[PDB]
Design an enzyme around this catalytic site. Structure first.
Site, PDB file in Angstrom:
ATOM      1  N   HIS F   6       0.862  -1.192   0.000  1.00 47.60           N
ATOM      2  CA  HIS F   6       0.000   0.000   0.000  1.00 47.60           C
ATOM      3  C   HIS F   6       0.896   1.238   0.000  1.00 47.60           C
ATOM      4  O   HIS F   6       1.191   1.827   1.043  1.00 47.60           O
ATOM      5  CB  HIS F   6      -0.960   0.002   1.189  1.00 47.60           C
ATOM      6  CG  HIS F   6      -2.029   1.049   1.103  1.00 47.60           C
ATOM      7  ND1 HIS F   6      -3.286   0.873   1.639  1.00 47.60           N
ATOM      8  CD2 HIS F   6      -2.026   2.284   0.549  1.00 47.60           C
ATOM      9  CE1 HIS F   6      -4.012   1.955   1.418  1.00 47.60           C
ATOM     10  NE2 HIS F   6      -3.271   2.826   0.757  1.00 47.60           N
ATOM     11  N   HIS F   8       1.698   4.966  -2.504  1.00 47.68           N
ATOM     12  CA  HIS F   8       1.168   5.879  -3.504  1.00 47.68           C
ATOM     13  C   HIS F   8       2.307   6.665  -4.136  1.00 47.68           C
ATOM     14  O   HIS F   8       3.221   7.128  -3.447  1.00 47.68           O
ATOM     15  CB  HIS F   8       0.134   6.828  -2.891  1.00 47.68           C
ATOM     16  CG  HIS F   8      -1.041   6.120  -2.293  1.00 47.68           C
ATOM     17  ND1 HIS F   8      -1.584   4.981  -2.845  1.00 47.68           N
ATOM     18  CD2 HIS F   8      -1.769   6.383  -1.181  1.00 47.68           C
ATOM     19  CE1 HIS F   8      -2.599   4.575  -2.101  1.00 47.68           C
ATOM     20  NE2 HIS F   8      -2.731   5.408  -1.087  1.00 47.68           N
ATOM     21  N   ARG F  72      -2.262   8.455  -5.985  1.00 50.21           N
ATOM     22  CA  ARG F  72      -2.730   9.012  -4.714  1.00 50.21           C
ATOM     23  C   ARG F  72      -4.249   9.123  -4.863  1.00 50.21           C
ATOM     24  O   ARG F  72      -4.720   9.933  -5.673  1.00 50.21           O
ATOM     25  CB  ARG F  72      -2.120  10.378  -4.336  1.00 50.21           C
ATOM     26  CG  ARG F  72      -0.693  10.724  -4.806  1.00 50.21           C
ATOM     27  CD  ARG F  72       0.517  10.229  -3.952  1.00 50.21           C
ATOM     28  NE  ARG F  72       0.411  10.219  -2.489  1.00 50.21           N
ATOM     29  CZ  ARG F  72       1.398   9.799  -1.682  1.00 50.21           C
ATOM     30  NH1 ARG F  72       2.557   9.371  -2.204  1.00 50.21           N
ATOM     31  NH2 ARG F  72       1.245   9.800  -0.354  1.00 50.21           N
ATOM     32  N   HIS F 179     -10.258   0.997  -2.130  1.00 46.97           N
ATOM     33  CA  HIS F 179      -9.741   2.297  -1.709  1.00 46.97           C
ATOM     34  C   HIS F 179     -10.646   3.391  -2.253  1.00 46.97           C
ATOM     35  O   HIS F 179     -10.816   3.504  -3.470  1.00 46.97           O
ATOM     36  CB  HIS F 179      -8.308   2.487  -2.207  1.00 46.97           C
ATOM     37  CG  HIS F 179      -7.482   3.389  -1.346  1.00 46.97           C
ATOM     38  ND1 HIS F 179      -7.920   4.625  -0.927  1.00 46.97           N
ATOM     39  CD2 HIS F 179      -6.239   3.236  -0.832  1.00 46.97           C
ATOM     40  CE1 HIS F 179      -6.986   5.191  -0.183  1.00 46.97           C
ATOM     41  NE2 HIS F 179      -5.953   4.371  -0.115  1.00 46.97           N
ATOM     42  N   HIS F 223      -6.422  -0.294   5.078  1.00 49.83           N
ATOM     43  CA  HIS F 223      -6.506   0.248   6.431  1.00 49.83           C
ATOM     44  C   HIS F 223      -7.138  -0.757   7.391  1.00 49.83           C
ATOM     45  O   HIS F 223      -8.030  -0.430   8.176  1.00 49.83           O
ATOM     46  CB  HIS F 223      -7.272   1.571   6.427  1.00 49.83           C
ATOM     47  CG  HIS F 223      -6.679   2.605   5.519  1.00 49.83           C
ATOM     48  ND1 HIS F 223      -7.325   3.069   4.394  1.00 49.83           N
ATOM     49  CD2 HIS F 223      -5.491   3.253   5.565  1.00 49.83           C
ATOM     50  CE1 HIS F 223      -6.565   3.966   3.791  1.00 49.83           C
ATOM     51  NE2 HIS F 223      -5.447   4.095   4.480  1.00 49.83           N
ATOM     52  N   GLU F 282       1.531   2.892   3.646  1.00 47.10           N
ATOM     53  CA  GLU F 282       1.237   4.196   3.042  1.00 47.10           C
ATOM     54  C   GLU F 282       2.345   5.203   3.322  1.00 47.10           C
ATOM     55  O   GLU F 282       2.102   6.411   3.412  1.00 47.10           O
ATOM     56  CB  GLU F 282      -0.103   4.756   3.524  1.00 47.10           C
ATOM     57  CG  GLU F 282      -0.843   5.575   2.468  1.00 47.10           C
ATOM     58  CD  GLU F 282      -0.681   7.080   2.631  1.00 47.10           C
ATOM     59  OE1 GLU F 282      -0.906   7.594   3.749  1.00 47.10           O
ATOM     60  OE2 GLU F 282      -0.341   7.749   1.626  1.00 47.10           O
TER      61      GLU F 282
HETATM   62  C1  LIG Z   1      -4.326   9.967  -0.431  1.00 48.17           C
HETATM   63  C2  LIG Z   1      -3.399  10.043   0.733  1.00 48.17           C
HETATM   64  C3  LIG Z   1      -2.708  11.317   0.984  1.00 48.17           C
HETATM   65  C4  LIG Z   1      -1.653  11.462   1.871  1.00 48.17           C
HETATM   66  O1  LIG Z   1      -1.135  10.603   2.583  1.00 48.17           O
HETATM   67  C5  LIG Z   1      -1.009  12.856   2.039  1.00 48.17           C
HETATM   68  C6  LIG Z   1      -0.667  13.618   0.908  1.00 48.17           C
HETATM   69  C7  LIG Z   1      -0.091  14.878   1.022  1.00 48.17           C
HETATM   70  C8  LIG Z   1       0.177  15.451   2.264  1.00 48.17           C
HETATM   71  C9  LIG Z   1      -0.159  14.697   3.382  1.00 48.17           C
HETATM   72  C10 LIG Z   1      -0.734  13.444   3.277  1.00 48.17           C
HETATM   73  C11 LIG Z   1      -3.233   8.938   1.497  1.00 48.17           C
HETATM   74  C12 LIG Z   1      -3.876   7.605   1.330  1.00 48.17           C
HETATM   75  O2  LIG Z   1      -4.321   7.245   0.252  1.00 48.17           O
HETATM   76  C13 LIG Z   1      -4.000   6.624   2.502  1.00 48.17           C
HETATM   77  O3  LIG Z   1      -4.032   7.112   3.676  1.00 48.17           O
HETATM   78  O4  LIG Z   1      -4.044   5.383   2.276  1.00 48.17           O
HETATM   79 ZN   LIG Z   2      -3.980   4.852   0.459  1.00 50.28          ZN
END
Ligand SMILES: CC(/C=C(\[O-])c1ccccc1)=C\C(=O)C(=O)O
Ligand SMILES: [Zn+2]
Ligand SMILES: CC(/C=C(\[O-])c1ccccc1)=C\C(=O)C(=O)O
Ligand SMILES: CC(/C=C(\[O-])c1ccccc1)=C\C(=O)C(=O)O
Ligand SMILES: [Zn+2]
Ligand SMILES: [Zn+2]
Ligand SMILES: [Zn+2]
Ligand SMILES: [Zn+2]
Ligand SMILES: [Zn+2]
Lengths: 331, 331, 332, 332, 331, 331
Positions: F6, F8, F72, F179, F223, F282
């Site tokens: 997992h 991104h 993402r 997701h 998660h 993540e």
């Molecule tokens: C989309 C996402 C985004 C972040 O983690 C993030 C991006 C930029 C700044 C701070 C945090 C997380 C997940 O998809 C997940 O939690 O699985």
């Molecule tokens: Zn994620």
């Protein structure tokens, strides 16, 4: 001679009362129809009303020999419900235009409205088209916004939603005269909506494959192409980033000369050339007022074209009759 | 000198990424902000990107000495939700324009976007206006359609909804620069929506009592006024039926010359007069394509105006600088 | 004499064309107005139209001496946009009615429409009411469904939304004449929506505290009360559970006799009493067709009432003039 | 004998609790079903509830020998979501009615509701109809407004949307019994919506070609036809312009006599004739209150018909049994 | 003793039939009300129905001495129209709970429903709250989604829309027991909606200023906080990028122990500590089934807490009664 | 070895600018595409940005040897209009992930996004799936709420709407990785919407007959399954009242370990078993904050699982690589 290709019928008052009735009972009284004598129709073609003179007398004073009269587009209520009142009113307007042209053939030529109901498939106008072909109609007003500036839009003119119509118009070899109808907007009333919709329809036709797929499609754009000749530069520049130039498609289009300033007429003709301009005036109508500087009527624009020193007699004859004879298959 | 009153910031790529980020998290990460150095801001104004050259380089080549730069309007997402991302992105773009015009005062003069959220009272932009006024901004882009061609629309510019803004603009004796933003229509892409919205805004301003109530309000209409100078005849004729002529209201308006054909430039300047035209090109952008035949770039239009024989050198000075200095309070 | 309390104006065709134009330009041409001479207004009251004879000629044949004329209510487009067109059209119809009654005063008495815009506060009609009051108008058509059978509906007549109007009417001592306008439904057209809305309005008024708060309010329900006299039993029965009987409030109401069957007229009069019935026919109109079994026009209903064995000549005089003269503040 | 063609089931309270539960979990507990014993179904037909006496005891007092019982229509929530709950509830009510008629056969005859979901094709009721046909049911309640006075409405009864049903009914030679259900309007509650929808349905059927295409279709309009017999004149007059008179099609229709005033019953019978009137009372129900002037329950209306001078004993036998026996295919 | 803080009234069948009636006639029959004898209410507290045994008998078999009974939340139809049926049904449920607790005070304690109508201002419940205070009610179920998973949402619990309620709850020093009601979604039925809404309400309360502005606000979150104790990590990590930690606010919250696995109970108690856990079971209800492995009833979870070797007798007494005594102001 | 299932993509800033551009012109400039070099793609994976270090550097530090990277999700705008920009942006993000995993095969393994447009039939993603399958992608992110917490929602995952996708996933024997993407709710920001949507998707899959019809379908819930392992008791008890237990359907499911507390990790692994858990973190992202007390980064969770005494070394091998190799068909 001078053939005016953009005119709207001067009808007896009974037609608009018939509209009010249809909207009042919405069909519970059945279709019915307009009951008027030939005498009343002829008299309507002479009634002063709100214009400086009668329709016929105005065309006479301006030297216009004949005029193609279509419905007054802002009455056609293409967004009204139920749909059958739209269809019925269109049919009755067309019947009355036919009667008037039969009674006054020395001047008036019939052009038809389409019973365009917002959301209905375009095929639903074919029947009426047929009825109008038999009656001798020479063209059809095509509305690109049957929703009449509502919350929804019709598809762009390049969408295959419109393709069954184009096909039919080519089978008949009869033209579509782009004309919007009414507008439900408080910002943009009908007379300005006409312009914006002409701009949009022209853009749609010039950035799609319509003319690849219907090379003989005849389209006359009202009011000198809305904004397009004036704004042609940005659209040509943006069309360079594509497989066809904006001007490539635009060369297939015809434009009427319903413009009430000499400068706009000059720009239109210099932009598209006399081979693609058809004289039009919409007299009597929006332009039937007196210029306080000259005393002339603003929609008496034939002399502007007759005095342009950059057009030959052949070009002026193209503009004043031959293009209309070809596009509208006039006798 | 040549002052171009219609330019849009060439911004570092991080600004658009910041827009995307705001839309992604919709505020759950806080306001944050663009993170770029003075060096990156300056470099963005020299990077070729899709243009034939850097923004500043093209200005130098065309003979332009200063340009008023505003946000790229089609990115401002006035119909996006929630409201706070519209406000925040407008604020950041204005801050970045301020940084660029402070770093490069030789070329660029700051013009602000308004954080207009569709449906919000106009007073919600006043704060941002004040901030921009403290940063030396010389004008504001006024979007007549913050709904971005959606199911709904804002009130016409004559409606008192907008009157609080006119007041403030007169309080500051600063101008509004009419310019639409995005367009959600599948028929009308943003570049055509610009033209139609300019037509509508000019019509509203010339058919309402805005200039009777705000005689000193300064308004610049983009793209030669959309369709208006070309379609002026019908609207003037219609206005004759009212208490104030369309022309007497329009005489109060200013227009920029963002037109990429000589004929349209001629028509604009001959219709509204050199006393109401401000040179503008939107270079680089929609017009930054090379005419493959004549070798020159379409938005290089200063020479057209320089060569018009019916303009005196004083008229050309008006078009090229003086009107801009008066309207935008240039030092 | 015979006074017909439910008639609708026979107007020159220019009025309906003006409606069409208002819808066509939606106000961008300005208010403008109906341009029509006195001679045209007169001629319209005699033109045969779709009726067997002219308006006045029919009223003469039927023995009606005077008729209260109001707008043709299915044309008043209370649900149309923008609001200013419904205001302007209502105003124009009112002034044309005023002119026709001024030109033919021996026959016609003016009753005004209200410029009810679906969703607007009712106060927005007051300015027009005042004007009509100074033009001699004797009543107002009240539409309980300005939305015209749309996706929304107005508050019931018991809601305080209407209370300002009920106040003004009592200030004026002039009546409301319940009448629906158009209907957008594809199931229930305008003529049937008339009946359904009369039923709903009467039910609203007979199950609320309107008449407790406005005891002197004068209300005339059209078309014999819609369905209520025929369906009174169930509503009385259900009202028994309430604090006031349905009949208790219904006795405060007046009804016109626009019913085109002898049985319906009999039921109405026997149900509400001659003290609360005002003769009305809507001639010329929906009922202006020949009953083949009689050769007489269906809306020539006065003889039915004249030949009712169970009514004294004094009750018939109440039905034919006194009630209208008192409810509509008519001169003598 | 006296057969009452318009009755509604007096069911154990567990049925309405089952409705509440269906709305509460919206199907996430599964279809489940009403859990109720025979003795409870019997006891419910005698429990006083809010009536002066039990259902059966009232029918005995009034001299009614048998009653056709159908669902209480204002509970059938045709506009509720999701669709499966209205289907399940209609089915459960139908089976409970079947059980009650099986347990008390000397008194009750089964009439089914249709699981009409606003917006669903009418074919979606056929499966239930078939089931009810095999359970001995003798008719079906037909709701012209499954949207229950909402923002939308169904097609009028003349629309081909309904034609499959009209076909099946003729296949079965069983009648539709026009009855609206609930009403979401704050102006027109359910009891008045009954009348308005009967008026609309009757108008639809008498101005379309339903009976040209389905000549043997058996339709019984509830509550004496709503407003139509009282307002017939205007509709006949307007129909003169059409190709068929309103009365021409109306003569094909049957009406029940659920009117709680002697005058209304007189008008109905004199208007449609004893050949097209089926005795009905909806006892116990809206009319189960005491008329103080008589001491008798308002829905004890059979004596009015019995004492009508203008009817032969044979006409009264048509009204009281023969018409119901032929329209609802009853045994003897 | 064992006080169960999450129980729902076992009512006579007449209550749910009253709901059906209200929805059928929608007020045309007037308010009316539930007509049931004390005997019938008591018997309802004993009726088997769908559970393995009666309500009272189940609490007896599980050692539960007393239980706080509130409305069965998925019947309360906070999104139904018209609003008055929502209010009336809430009031009648509360009246019946009051009668049952007065008749069976040796076991049942009253907790009240709120007549939350979607879209109405929260003030509209105050009257009923007052009526319930006088009747001796010890708390209120607070629904964060009166729209019942419709097309619209209520404001988040940090929005000042809810502040008048918090104020009142502090004036009374009575708690809000977070509990969603029904769900109109086909994806997420009521029993799962409970969990998602508990998660959302907890998140709202832990990322807003509620506890800054109402420091004595008492809130019990149903079903062990929905997802939050299990997912606490991501929310704490994200709260680091802010002025207050998620755990900072979360330490102000109470949670009931309506969890039917030992592992979840362990995680809840280890995450929030016994000082903030109130024993609850929802018996009889969702959990009243037999574990085929052990033969025990899934909602008989008191022994799981009694056998945790990481809790002292004082911690277990906090969980089983003292926390309920304080939070619900129990005699 | 340690495989993180997992992750991104850390993308060059030009990708998000391309998103903003697409939203600005809404297709009137054509599809275009991201313009970045292999060098910029590689540099993006080493840039610190907001993280404490570069993506690859953090992976190296935490002991992770390979990571499966997907888009993402909160940027994928499945509810945006027009549909073509959703499709195009998904396609470009997938192409960029492909480029990065081809440039850096030591670390990254490609997982694809699906071009899910809210309201479109699911088959409209098949084309893109095929393309990604030809590029070596090993899985797909499956969004149960392409309406992104809007007024409408898609059918539950048990509805046959999704059955064409299950078929294809079994045809390819490739997995779906549940997701969610964005969230339009003012109550529920995207990071909480993730959890709630995972709860709903797992519930749908465990209460429908999906696994009776597709016994080989591979599904990984992100998660730790949202709320499910924590709230398993109530759903199991409710399922006892049906034909198939919640647990027997859930036994077919896989879950990743993106949980940032030891206790939640323990609960997950003890509830579903090591045979159904895939390590995931993540990192970098929501969990990439430094615990100021204990000095370590919150998404560095491998050591927690390494130190669990109730797991054998074979169980840890399953969690850390074997399950990922089986599910995502790793070489
Ligand atoms: C989309 C996402 C985004 C972040 O983690 C993030 C991006 C930029 C700044 C701070 C945090 C997380 C997940 O998809 C997940 O939690 O699985
Ligand atoms: Zn994620
Ligand atoms: C927004 C805008 C955009 C461009 O020019 C453009 C941007 C990127 C690529 C190509 C063109 C122009 C104007 O505002 C205007 O025309 O005044
Ligand atoms: C409302 C509710 C419903 C049941 O318990 C229930 C009702 C009837 C049959 C089976 C179960 C549960 C909760 O509120 C909760 O779980 O807290
Ligand atoms: Zn025209
Ligand atoms: Zn621009
Ligand atoms: Zn009338
Ligand atoms: Zn009934
Ligand atoms: Zn609960």
């Amino acid at each position: 001679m001078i053939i005016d290709c953009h005119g709207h019928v001067s009808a007896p008052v009974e037609l608009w009362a018939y509209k009010a009735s249809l909207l009042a009972h919405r069909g519970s009284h059945g279709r019915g129809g307009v009951k008027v004598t030939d005498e009343q129709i002829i008299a309507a073609a002479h009634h002063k009303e709100t214009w400086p003179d009668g329709h016929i007398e105005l065309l006479h004073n301006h030297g216009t020999d004949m005029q193609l009269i279509s419905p007054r587009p802002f009455q056609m209520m293409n967004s009204a419900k139920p749909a059958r009142v739209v269809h019925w009113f269109c049919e009755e307007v067309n019947t009355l235009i036919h009667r008037q042209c039969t009674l006054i053939p020395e001047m008036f030529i019939p052009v038809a409205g389409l019973p365009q109901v917002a959301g209905e498939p375009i095929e639903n106008v074919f029947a009426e088209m047929d009825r109008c072909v038999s009656m001798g109609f020479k063209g059809f007003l095509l509305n690109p916004d049957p929703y009449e500036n509502g919350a929804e839009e019709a598809p762009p003119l390049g969408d295959r939603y419109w393709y069954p119509l184009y096909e039919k118009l080519c089978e008949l070899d009869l033209p579509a005269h782009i004309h919007a109808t009414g507008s439900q907007s408080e910002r943009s009333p009908y007379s300005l909506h006409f312009i914006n919709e002409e701009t949009i329809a022209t853009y749609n036709l010039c950035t799609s494959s319509v003319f690849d797929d219907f090379p003989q499609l005849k389209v006359v754009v009202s009011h000198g192409g809305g904004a397009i000749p004036y704004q042609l530069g940005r659209f040509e520049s943006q069309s360079r980033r594509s497989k066809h130039l904006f001007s490539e498609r635009m060369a297939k289009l015809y434009f009427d000369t319903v413009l009430y300033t000499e400068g706009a007429l000059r720009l239109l003709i210099e932009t598209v050339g006399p081979e693609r301009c058809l004289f039009g005036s919409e007299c009597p109508g929006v332009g039937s007022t007196i210029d306080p500087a000259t005393g002339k009527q603003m929609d008496h624009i034939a002399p502007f074209i007759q005095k342009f020193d950059f057009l030959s007699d052949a070009d002026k004859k193209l503009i004043f009759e031959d293009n209309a004879r070809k596009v509208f298959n006039l006798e």
